[PDB]
Design a protein around this ligand. Sequence first.
Ligand SMILES: CC(C)=CCC/C(C)=C/CC/C(C)=C/COP(=O)(O)OP(=O)(O)O
Ligand SMILES: CC(C)=CCC/C(C)=C/CC/C(C)=C/COP(=O)(O)OP(=O)(O)O
Ligand SMILES: [Mg+2]
Ligand SMILES: [Mg+2]
Lengths: 329, 329, 197, 197
Amino acid sequence: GSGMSWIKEGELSLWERFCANIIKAGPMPKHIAFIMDGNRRYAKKCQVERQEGHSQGFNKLAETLRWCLNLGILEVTVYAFSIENFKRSKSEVDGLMDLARQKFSRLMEEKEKLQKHGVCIRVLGDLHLLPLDLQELIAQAVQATKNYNKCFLNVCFAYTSRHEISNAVREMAWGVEQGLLDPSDISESLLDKCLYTNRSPHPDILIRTSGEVRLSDFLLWQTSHSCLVFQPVLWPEYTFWNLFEAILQFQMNHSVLQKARDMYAEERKRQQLERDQATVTEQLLREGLQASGDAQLRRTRLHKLSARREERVQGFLQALELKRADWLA
Amino acid sequence: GSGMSWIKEGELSLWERFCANIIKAGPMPKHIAFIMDGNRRYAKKCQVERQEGHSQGFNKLAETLRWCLNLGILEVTVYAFSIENFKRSKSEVDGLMDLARQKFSRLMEEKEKLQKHGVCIRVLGDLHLLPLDLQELIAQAVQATKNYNKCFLNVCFAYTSRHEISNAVREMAWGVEQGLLDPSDISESLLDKCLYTNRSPHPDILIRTSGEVRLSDFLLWQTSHSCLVFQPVLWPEYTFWNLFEAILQFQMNHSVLQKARDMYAEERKRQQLERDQATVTEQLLREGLQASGDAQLRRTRLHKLSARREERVQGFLQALELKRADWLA
Amino acid sequence: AAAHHRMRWRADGRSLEKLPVHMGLVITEVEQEPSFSDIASLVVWCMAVGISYISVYDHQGIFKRNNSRLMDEILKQQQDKDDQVLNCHLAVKVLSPEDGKADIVRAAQDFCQLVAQKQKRPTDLDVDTLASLLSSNGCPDPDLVLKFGPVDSTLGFLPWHIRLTEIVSLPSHLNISYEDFFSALRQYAACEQRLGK
Amino acid sequence: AAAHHRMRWRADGRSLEKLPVHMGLVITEVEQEPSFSDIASLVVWCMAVGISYISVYDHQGIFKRNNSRLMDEILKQQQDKDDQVLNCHLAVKVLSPEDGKADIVRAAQDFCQLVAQKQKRPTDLDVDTLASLLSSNGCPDPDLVLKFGPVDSTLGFLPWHIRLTEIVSLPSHLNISYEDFFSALRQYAACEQRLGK
Ligand SMILES: CC(C)=CCC/C(C)=C/CC/C(C)=C/COP(=O)(O)OP(=O)(O)O
Ligand SMILES: CC(C)=CCC/C(C)=C/CC/C(C)=C/COP(=O)(O)OP(=O)(O)O
Ligand SMILES: [Mg+2]
Ligand SMILES: [Mg+2]
């Protein structure tokens, strides 16, 4: 299939291929998230116009996505346009919208090539803030590449994490209002499935280029246990070796980060069990029943409490997925 | 040390020794309890006087205790005189008291021989109902053979199980009254340590001779999970092979009985944990605190609840042991 | 014919030298789930021949966790429905291990709490008063236990209450016949309790 | 001399281009138990140079389960005692993972319950109102997080609140010097937040 424009690439060189085989003997990330920062500074550095920096920045995204595929990293998430970026000048915002119109739209025309390689394109954000035509181009690309499995690019556009989290709560609130949810069903696990990223596992790595050491409202919930890598390089100058260094950072953190991630999950489940047992106890000392009977009343009520919750959640998620799939464009 | 009168014995014959080695390859009982029944019917069968039946019955106890030792069964408990037996005729009750005076008292004179073989003699019952002189002979024998380890004979005399259980509760009630116990500390485990038999593990086997198929107020608490063996033989006619048959019955029951015993104990501990968690929950929703905190407040309070209980129990048991050891005679 | 069956069972119970006021059914068999229709038959047979109370027991609490299925089966085999239900509830108790030792402990806790509240003295607790606290307060102790299955153990069945209980053992309850049940009653009727004498 | 030390720390904080109103201390080191005297020094340094709020955090909840030992150590290093205690309680928060995601969940439960009680509509929940429910309601978000130890992760520290927080990393807190702490402040003071522009 040669190369798409979102985009294709050549194989790894000898040294890149060698180092890849070495680090592939240890834990590898399944999902990397990039804050693509420093385009404008790069334009000023190369005496090019700001629009040229952003367009070069898109080229680097296509190149970096090829490196990830050549490393067997099949899911990538990128911060392409923040809601805060709407505060930039009309000339720059229009330049970014026109780029997105041009790179999308080229996604079509390159259809079939996306279907040949199973490339799923997801675009995450408060997309009602984008120009209507850009929304329709986005929707077509997302609708066309759905049901594709081989790899996954999540383009965060008109996105912030706080807007994403509050939307996830709104979705759960709608569930309660619709009768699909009880307020007690709300959970960290359920909130996770209400995020824009709910078809993706949390990133193993979060990379931010240029010298900035902050998250800038990107995947705050998703990266709470992710390896964080801040590299001074400007995004349009990103190399395979910057990516390699980041993966190396992840491998050195992996054992601690895994154990902490696992200890956090076990502690949350432990406290959730304690909470459910206390609920069952309260309902039982209300009324006249007891908690330590041979009848195992507590245990039957605990199983029904959790089964009804899971049944209500599965119904809500299915309705949420039906609402999310429902789209003119 | 040849033979004591409570009493000594010869080694096993060839066939007895052979069968012993066979069954010793499987689970063996550590403690057997006997209801020595049928002495009077045996006297009528042999055209001897009732007192001769009871005296022969004592001889069989000494013989049976030798068989148990030759089999490596080092703890035996026997029902020698029930409180209900006080309802028998003065002539028969006196005959039994005189026998006990004679077999005790012969325990002394045979001192040192008991100390040479580490024979611990315990006498369990509401002994204040016995003649004062018999009480003093009993007390001397019990006091002399305390601190002996090699084997253990528990003679239940003026005993019933209901009197034993209610005394155990009285002891725990005294603990509460003395400030050594809280009412919530009372437990199946604690009640066990307040029984007359609290220095003995529960019997593996309960044997009752003659054709009677009832417990007659003997070790009701202790034998709830014991193998029960009812043999038609009259007690003075007991043979090694009746004992062997009973051990065989125990080995056939052992796997089921063990699992049931183990399942009961795990279920009791499970329900005790559920109860303690519910207590901690109630104390926590009283006041304003919560149950699922990172501070692990519930877990700290659960550990303190159980540690203070265990501390109070250990103090009560030590005081109970000091009261029990305190004896003029 | 219904009146004929009733008369036969009444004549059967009345013919024995004695009948248990309270009978216990102890099910030790764990290889197969207990057969509720067979247990219900036994219970109906007891009621039909004149026994006042029947306690159904298994060490795993299976009967206690399937109480409604057992009552329904018992009511079915008897054939106002409210009156029959009330009668079965007054005669039948479905027990499990907690009804033995764990309930003696509960009574001792209640008594010790009265000592703590200065309402009672430790010397107040005697055998009679312990039985008064025992959750079986108004009911007679079991006269007869029918034990089913291959386990030679009461497996925690009402330890306090079986001090004088006759224990008859049957190999299985799985297809129990009325003749097998009545044979046990005949055995109980032939027992002589000398009560220590 | 006490007034001299105070003046120096005030001059130090006042000399920087900017000072964090709210600083977070994230301790990732798990090989050794955290050193309470070193944490207390950092906290006292923040207060001395003019920082309003300090949040102390570790993923294991060690600080939250040893809150009193940490306050006592903080109060000790400062040297009415009631006034100093009240001041430390107003400035210092001891956090653990439950203060992040688990508290966002708590706010969402509270809001959904209001929807259930017909008091609010799902569309009422926006970013501002979510922050109002967030248990950090009256407090500013952390301007600066000092991360100690070798883990390149915030390990669940206040995800909602660190959207703009500058994250400076130090290798260890174990024998932390005032110069090392002030170097971090100088780094934070040199940061430029363009807020999307
Ligand atoms: C889907 C699509 C076509 C996306 C466009 C491609 C792309 C790389 C967009 C990112 C634009 C952006 C805000 C870069 C941030 O660096 P910056 O502008 O803040 O540079 P600076 O920090 O040096 O000022
Ligand atoms: C410590 C000591 C010296 C004890 C005495 C020895 C001994 C064997 C006592 C048991 C006496 C007794 C009540 C036997 C019961 O059979 P039974 O009298 O009821 O006979 P029956 O059932 O045929 O009427
Ligand atoms: Mg930038
Ligand atoms: Mg007898």
